Amino acid sequence: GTVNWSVEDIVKGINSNNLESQLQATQAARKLLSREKQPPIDNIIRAGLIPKFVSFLGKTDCSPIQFESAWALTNIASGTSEQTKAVVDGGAIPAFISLLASPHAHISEQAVWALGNIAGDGSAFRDLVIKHGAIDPLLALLAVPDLSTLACGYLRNLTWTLSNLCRNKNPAPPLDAVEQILPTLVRLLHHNDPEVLADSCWAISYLTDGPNERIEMVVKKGVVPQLVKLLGATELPIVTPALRAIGNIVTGTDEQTQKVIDAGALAVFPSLLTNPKTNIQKEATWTMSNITAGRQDQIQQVVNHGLVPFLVGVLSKADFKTQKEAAWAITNYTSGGTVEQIVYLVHCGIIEPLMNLLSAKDTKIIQVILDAISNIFQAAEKLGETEKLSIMIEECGGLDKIEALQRHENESVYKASLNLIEKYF
């Protein structure tokens, strides 16, 4: 009945003065915009239909046309930034915010979804949705004693839209908006649905991707233990955002990092640092690199949890990006560590893989490795065992690699290699 209409027929129906004809044409538009392959969004926009749909959003007496137009506009807003902008330019934001209070749950859900797409376009539309007052009604939709009474799809859509309100930087979301959203986010972070958990973790990861004051806003809510628990989940879609959030948090101050450690995060890293998903391994090793950049007691907790052998493992075999993160972790470790910690590192077998990685073409990883070797040599000097370390490097085939780097294009690599050769070889 409303299937496979032409845009011409849709226009004729919507331009009729008959609300039922308008409803049928709007539903045909919705079905066109819901097709799997290349929905004709641009044709619908060029036909001038967005203002009509937006006006239909306000037909409180015809809830079906509200729903159909909300769905059509949601799918238009799901397209390119220009198509989302076409929806915003038609006045859709305040109309959808008004629909958030609809007594019909499917209409409220559709408005939530549409605002999620609009905010997901970027920081400008995110902040514009916020300025029009979306957060209060959105959060009111979740003000129930037990989230489990809400329909699963409804709650998932609310969580996703809230996550888009937390997303993007340059600028980051307004501080007052983040403080307004965070308590509901914590509650959602304790929900049992895997998709709600995943999107809540993503929102926290966004909110912690910034300066230390944003991180502090988050960690003062006490969510770090829940994030560690989720770090241990079996569902990769939960572990990925949980790990991103924990890594962001350990980019902060030593005290925030210590909050991560105290919550028991390090005990999860034997599995994370051997995870079959390359992205998990890379992100876990980056997190480790930022933990080894911390205090000597924090390096010591890395040692106690038995993680140095796992760093040697990643450095020995992993995708190259993860090996680069591991090199960074080793260099930070040797920069901040005691002499005893550095000798422990050597005793775990770091030198041979660290030397094998000097065969790489990336200049940055070579510089990182040369810095680490210099630090290890400084510790050896403090112990008077520099000759033993030199022999160690020579047996690995590393002296050849260093003396070869003496002929490298980068000045820093050149000078560092020559300095090592002159002082210790």
Added chain:
Amino acid sequence: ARKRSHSPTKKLRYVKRRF
């Protein structure tokens, strides 16, 4: 030894079409 922040996301827009 300084902390290193995460790389900028290359996914700049997050939108969902309702099928």
